[PDB]
Amino acid sequence: EEELARIAERKKESGRRLQEQAAKMRLERLMKKEQELEYYKDIQRRMQGESKKEIKRLLDEAELKDEAALERVIRDLERSIKRARQQRLLKSNWEARQRAKAEKEAEKARLAEEARLDEERRKNDLEGWLEEKRQLRLAKLNQLKERERLKADLGNRKSLASQIRMKNIALEAAIRSLENDLLRYDKTFSYDMTLDAQR
DSSP: EEEHHHHHHHHHHHHHHHHHHHHHHHHHHHHHHHHHHHHOOOOOOHHHEEEEGHHHHHHHHHHHHHHHHHHHHHHHHHHHHHHHHHHHHHHHHHHHHHHHHHHHHHHHHHHHHHHHHHHHHHSSSHHHHHHHHHHHHHHHHHHHHHHHHHHHHHSSSTTTHHHHHHHHHHHHHHHHHHHHHHHHOOOOOOOGGGTTTOO
């Protein structure tokens, strides 16, 4: 069994190191992408400050056409960071770490708040609250079935990509979660309904 601990050490340490590698990459992305967000905002602010003729040429500093497109990538950067002598620098790095921490902590609160509503919707509007989940599952099923069908529709013949490119040139966890609550509280729902049982 001593080898099993040693293997477990390798498994534990290698897995942890890989997670550290992703975190290190993502923590690096924290400073850069927050600063890129700050960079984009300064482009917006300066663009907003300068004459109305300047809008696209100044936002070209963010290499984007309009604040809507810049907001889209901003939101994705915001999503990403939300989804994610040296003492001067260390505090800045420490700041970047803390910034994302607040974003996720507020996310958990937002999810918890969303849960609090659903708790009371469930506790009082149960049938409608369950009917929500059923139809959501049906949509998610339709989406997955279409996605699974698309995964047959795609690859059907390689040059599909190169054909269509000429036009230019010239769900799982959700389905599971919905099922889990139905199994918990929709006593009319049953495991044989699930995609799990269906496979």
